[PDB]
Amino acid sequence: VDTVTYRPGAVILYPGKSDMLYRVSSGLVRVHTMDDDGNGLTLRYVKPGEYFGEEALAGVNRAYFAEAVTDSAIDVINPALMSAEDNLVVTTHLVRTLERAYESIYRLVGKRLRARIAGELLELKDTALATQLDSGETMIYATHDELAAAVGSVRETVTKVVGELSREGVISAGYGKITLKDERALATIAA
């Protein structure tokens, strides 16, 4: 139906009653909440082609926020107007999204923070937060606070681990930027 643009950091959906279905056409969206200390917790990143606000399909309310991470173009969809073919597409996306939620759970319980940090950097490599340097390396735009929210940690501990991974030579750390110097080694650490 209609496409709306949002600037970085703008809220798309607040917790409350459901309404329409949304799809990322371009950019990057973050579904998140707050913990009991006010610290953020990212539930998932939503890449182009992926849907959010699906609670509209079930009429259930939404308990999360959705915000634009980068400049983003979002398509707004009416669930009733959708055709059966489109419904199959959304269903396929939901299955994949639930599979990613279960992987997030497994990793929260079963992986050390360095493994979670390494996996998250590789995930962000295929998003709008990533750019290719002249060296050919991938650089990710993320602060240590944004990483902490994505892996369920706190800034201070993420900073320590970024320091360790820099000393191991697998990343080069910057100011709100992290260059992936050895993506094979990152995959090994992440597993």
Next chain:
Amino acid sequence: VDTVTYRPGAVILYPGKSDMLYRVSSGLVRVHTMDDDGNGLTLRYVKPGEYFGEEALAGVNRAYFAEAVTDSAIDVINPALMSAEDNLVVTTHLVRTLERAYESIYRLVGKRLRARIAGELLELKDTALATQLDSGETMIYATHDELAAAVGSVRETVTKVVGELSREGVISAGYGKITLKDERALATIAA
């Protein structure tokens, strides 16, 4: 289509290629995996009326196990044979299941173990693991190892917390059984 019965502890689905869609008609199923130490991790309990094995809809493989917790009757469904009306039902269930996955994440990151244990007992109150004593209290059949897998902890720490909640007078602990003596107080602890 067809309905199959499984005894307690029997494996319904192994990790591998997807096939059919499954629904619990009676009983209780557990979707789970193993961590890096061999310890179990429950992803969710599946109650009567709820679906599992949805990866069949998307043709993706399954990375989890599904097992019968109690004596259970499971309906096997062919995704292609399904009608559009049935597809809407499964889609609604998926949305709710994803909402429960996100709540699981939030609680793993943001809640202390006593809060997670208390919330889980109240969740199991409406399952086949629950029975009503003559006193009117609800009793749950669960070992401390089964609780640890449901809240992402280890047995030894769950045992300590069960001891604390017993001394606070909110449960009465038994051998593979826990009686909910004060469900209001449990809800307060869980929040």
